Amino acid sequence: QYPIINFTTAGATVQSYTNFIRAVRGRLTTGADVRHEIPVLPNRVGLPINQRFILVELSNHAELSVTLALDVTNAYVVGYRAGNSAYFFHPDNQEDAEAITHLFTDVQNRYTFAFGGNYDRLEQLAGNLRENIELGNGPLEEAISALYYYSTGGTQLPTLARSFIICIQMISEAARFQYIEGEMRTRIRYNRRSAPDPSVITLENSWGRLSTAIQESNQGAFASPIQLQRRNGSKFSVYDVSILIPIIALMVYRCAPPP
Amino acid sequence: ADVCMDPEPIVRIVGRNGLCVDVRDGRFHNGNAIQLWPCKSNTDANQLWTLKRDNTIRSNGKCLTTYGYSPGVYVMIYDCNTAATDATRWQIWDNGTIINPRSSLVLAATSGNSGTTLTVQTNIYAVSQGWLPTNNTQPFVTTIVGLYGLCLQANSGQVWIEDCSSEKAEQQWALYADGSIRPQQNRDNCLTSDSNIRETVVKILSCGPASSGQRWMFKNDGTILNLYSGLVLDVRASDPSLKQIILYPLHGDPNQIWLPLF
Amino acid sequence: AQVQLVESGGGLVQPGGSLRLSCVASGFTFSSTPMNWFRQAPGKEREFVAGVGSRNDIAYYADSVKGRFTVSRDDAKNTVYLQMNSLKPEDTGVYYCKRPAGRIEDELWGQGTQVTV
Ligand SMILES: *[C@@H]1O[C@H](CO)[C@@H](O[C@@H]2O[C@H](CO)[C@@H](O[C@@H]3O[C@H](CO)[C@@H](O)[C@H](O)[C@@H]3O)[C@H](O)[C@H]2NC(C)=O)[C@H](O)[C@H]1NC(C)=O
Ligand SMILES: *[C@@H]1O[C@H](CO)[C@@H](O[C@@H]2O[C@H](CO)[C@@H](O[C@@H]3O[C@H](CO)[C@@H](O)[C@H](O)[C@@H]3O)[C@H](O)[C@H]2NC(C)=O)[C@H](O)[C@H]1NC(C)=O
Ligand SMILES: *[C@@H]1O[C@H](CO)[C@@H](O[C@@H]2O[C@H](CO)[C@@H](O)[C@H](O)[C@H]2NC(C)=O)[C@H](O[C@@H]2O[C@@H](C)[C@@H](O)[C@@H](O)[C@@H]2O)[C@H]1NC(C)=O
Ligand SMILES: OC[C@H]1O[C@@H](O)[C@H](O)[C@@H](O)[C@H]1O
Ligand SMILES: OC[C@H]1O[C@@H](O)[C@H](O)[C@@H](O)[C@H]1O
Ligand SMILES: [Cl-]
Ligand SMILES: [Cl-]
Ligand SMILES: [Cl-]
Ligand SMILES: [Cl-]
Ligand SMILES: [Cl-]
Ligand SMILES: [Cl-]
Ligand SMILES: [Zn+2]
Numbered sequence: 240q241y242p243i244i245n246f247t248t249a250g251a252t253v254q255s256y257t258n259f260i261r262a263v264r265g266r267l268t269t270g271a272d273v274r275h276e277i278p279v280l281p282n283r284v285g286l287p288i289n290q291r292f293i294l295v296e297l298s299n300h301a302e303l304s305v306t307l308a309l310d311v312t313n314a315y316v317v318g319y320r321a322g323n324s325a326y327f328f329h330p331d332n333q334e335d336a337e338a339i340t341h342l343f344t345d346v347q348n349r350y351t352f353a354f355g356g357n358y359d360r361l362e363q364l365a366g367n368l369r370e371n372i373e374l375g376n377g378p379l380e381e382a383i384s385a386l387y388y389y390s391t392g393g394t395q396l397p398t399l400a401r402s403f404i405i406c407i408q409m410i411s412e413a414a415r416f417q418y419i420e421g422e423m424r425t426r427i428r429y430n431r432r433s434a435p436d437p438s439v440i441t442l443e444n445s446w447g448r449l450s451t452a453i454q455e456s457n458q459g460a461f462a463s464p465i466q467l468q469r470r471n472g473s474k475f476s477v478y479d480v481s482i483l484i485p486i487i488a489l490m491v492y493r494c495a496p497p498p
Numbered sequence: 499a500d501v502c503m504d505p506e507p508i509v510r511i512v513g514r515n516g517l518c519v520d521v522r523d524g525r526f527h528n529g530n531a532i533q534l535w536p537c538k539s540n541t542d543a544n545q546l547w548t549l550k551r552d553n554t555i556r557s558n559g560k561c562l563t564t565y566g567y568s569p570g571v572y573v574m575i576y577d578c579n580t581a582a583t584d585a586t587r588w589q590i591w592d593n594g595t596i597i598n599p600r601s602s603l604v605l606a607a608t609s610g611n612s613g614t615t616l617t618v619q620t621n622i623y624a625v626s627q628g629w630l631p632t633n634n635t636q637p638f639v640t641t642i643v644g645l646y647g648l649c650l651q652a653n654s655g656q657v658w659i660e661d662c663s664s665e666k667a668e669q670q671w672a673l674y675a676d677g678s679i680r681p682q683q684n685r686d687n688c689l690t691s692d693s694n695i696r697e698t699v700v701k702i703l704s705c706g707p708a709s710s711g712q713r714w715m716f717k718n719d720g721t722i723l724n725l726y727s728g729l730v731l732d733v734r735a736s737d738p739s740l741k742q743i744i745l746y747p748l749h750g751d752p753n754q755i756w757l758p759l760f
Numbered sequence: 761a762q763v764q765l766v767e768s769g770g771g772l773v774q775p776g777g778s779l780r781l782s783c784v785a786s787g788f789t790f791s792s793t794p795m796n797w798f799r800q801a802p803g804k805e806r807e808f809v810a811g812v813g814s815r816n817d818i819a820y821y822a823d824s825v826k827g828r829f830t831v832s833r834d835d836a837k838n839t840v841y842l843q844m845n846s847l848k849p850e851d852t853g854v855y856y857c858k859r860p861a862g863r864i865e866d867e868l869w870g871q872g873t874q875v876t877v
Contacts, residue, residue, distance in 0.1 A: 479631055
């Protein structure tokens with residue numbers, strides 16, 4: 240099977256969550272391709288199918304287990320297994336559709352949702368924007384149980400979508416950003432349960448453009464600014480990768496380095 | 499995969515004390531000196547530089563040019579064609595250094611005053627040699643969180659980590675384009691390292707010297723690196739109660755990991 | 761709460777002598793936890809002596825004691841060591857092992873051991 244990374248919310252810890260995210264980044268990319276101090280994810284074109292996905296097994300106090308599947312080309316969730324059932328977001332293309340079939344081949348019941356995994360769709364289904372969905376070890380613990388009981392009939396579609404938004408931000412987005420990983424570290428350290436502030440929201444919305452801006456930059460200076468927000472909501476623009484070096488940890492492969 | 503397109507952005511180039519790379523008096527005769535000047539917010543060409551694909555930096559169609567290849571000579575504006583092309587080539591590094599490959603010398607501002615004539619010097623990774631291409635004429639004010647979730651704080655001339663609090667201005671740090679980290683309460687002082695040797699206690703001192711000990715870079719791994727010494731910022735022995743932040747060789751334990759909040 | 765440090769190994773020695781102090785931890789994941797040694801002489805304040813990171817590569821030493829003591833770690837035995845060589849009369853005091861923390865209430869001391877001359 241694909242590589243498996245494990246995390247538990249039972250007795251979760253700043254160190255345990257950090258070691259979890261570090262281990263995820265270590266399997267998402269090899270770190271061999273780095274631009275302006277920022278590691279780049281593997282290029283999808285040329286990536287063999289037996290290296291396309293990374294599995295993340297999650298557990299909670301109720302000792303339920305849900306195994307997420309991450310695309311290594313964008314660190315994003317494409318689906319998940321629970322018990323004898325596998326579920327997948329609606330794939331964007333035909334190539335992604337057949338690649339799905341190489342995941343969780345053991346499972347007796349695979350499913351493809353009518354909806355994709357993007358935030359616009361998930362919140363429509365969840366009935367709440369990200370600004371009103373709290374994050375923390377608590378939400379993740381509840382998100383693990385709801386994802387599992389969907390394969391049982393006990394989870395409603397809005398609760399399912401809410402749990403996806405929770406898992407994606409604490410795993411996928413935390414992998415892409417030391418900043419988001421740090422924001423999750425703060426929630427775990429003080430055992431607080433909190434919705435993400437504007438600075439976290441816009442970073443997630445800008446990750447695709449940030450990868451393009453950094454890789455298509457002239458020695459770090461962007462061709463055009465990227466607008467971000469502070470934690471209090473104020474707006475500021477970024478023109479160079481230097482301030483982003485501690486902020487971003489992974490990028491989509493966009494293009495080849497100078498050679 | 500296609501090779502990344504290399505754009506030619508138009509930006510200001512901010513450096514020591516937040517001043518801007520400026521073509522003096524807006525005059526564009528060959529040999530006119532480049533200087534530091536307070537950053538403008540208009541469309542005047544003499545502070546807007548085009549980073550072209552030929553590694554030349556141009557204002558108003560003419561090139562930023564080093565007079566020579568010896569440390570100490572000034573940097574001027576010049577016709578890109580009639581100048582020695584090796585004197586017009588520049589590399590902009592992710593650590594804030596702008597180097598001329600032919601001479602291995604570095605664009606520098608040996609003085610921090612408005613009107614300082616820019617020169618090329620031997621690289622020592624000082625504040626006088628730190629630059630950032632941007633349109634942001636102001637530094638970025640941020641909180642620095644570290645070990646155990648504590649916040650870096652400045653008192654008088656000392657620096658340590660305490661419990662975070664939003665109303666503490668002494669926990670606000672302005673990250674300047676020259677690579678220095680300055681307390682918001684006093685933009686004239688810098689996060690300074692006394693020596694380049696290990697366990698040197700870091701203090702708050704005047705940015706006057708603009709030295710190698712006052713230039714820092716936020717690395718991708720969460721550390722704050724002093725470029726010249728190669729040492730990192732360290733919460734000594736992972737014990738905030740010591741009230742000592744030091745330089746120490748890189749090892750990555752949590753007492754060397756920081757994060758700038760917004 | 762059950763996390764606890766047991767220092768051991770102090771004794772009475774004369775100048776130029778040597779001693780190894782050991783503190784054994786229990787109740788937590790000992791590996792990767794930074795551990796520091798302190799000493800309080802009669803009348804004076806508790807002063808930092810040495811401290812080890814996750815590896816024995818990582819060690820911080822007070823100026824008073826450089827080139828003489830060695831802080832050490834054995835993750836398998838849940839033990840911190842303070843090898844004390846070339847001992848002097850100035851090193852007399854109760855030696856405490858500490859797990860540092862963000863708040864002082866989460867600081868973690870043992871009961872210390874006495875070192876004389
Ligand atoms: C930083 O601020 C400067 C000052 O406004 C910006 O320079 C301006 O950039 C725009 C577009 O990037 C230039 O307009 C362009 O002019 C060309 C030439 O005619 C035209 O072909 C384009 O369609 C576009 O209209 C504008 O001239 C320029 N202003 C100057 C040079 O004074 C700069 O873009 C900002 N940098 C970043 C990275 O955002
Ligand atoms: C500040 O940034 C510059 C560039 O980002 C750093 O200089 C570069 O450092 C790398 C790695 O240390 C050098 O790589 C070497 O390349 C040569 C030739 O390709 C090769 O023979 C070596 O085996 C090694 O791979 C590189 O030469 C060097 N210079 C340039 C122009 O890239 C610089 O070290 C940074 N300074 C600090 C203090 O971090
Ligand atoms: C997450 O948990 C999995 C189950 O506990 C780990 O797989 C197990 O790894 C053991 C190595 O310490 C190995 O003996 C077991 O046979 C294996 N169990 C399986 C595969 O069912 C997994 O460990 C990683 O993956 C395995 C396949 C090995 O390659 C190890 O080198 C890996 O550490 C755990 N994942 C991580 C990232 O620790
Ligand atoms: O609404 C704030 C944010 O919330 C998401 O639900 C939306 O899809 C994003 O585009 C962003 O705008
Ligand atoms: O050098 C003195 C100053 O002279 C002004 O005329 C010019 O606009 C400024 O950019 C600066 O060069
Ligand atoms: Cl293949
Ligand atoms: Cl379809
Ligand atoms: Cl198949
Ligand atoms: Cl994307
Ligand atoms: Cl910027
Ligand atoms: Cl010339
Ligand atoms: Zn197939």
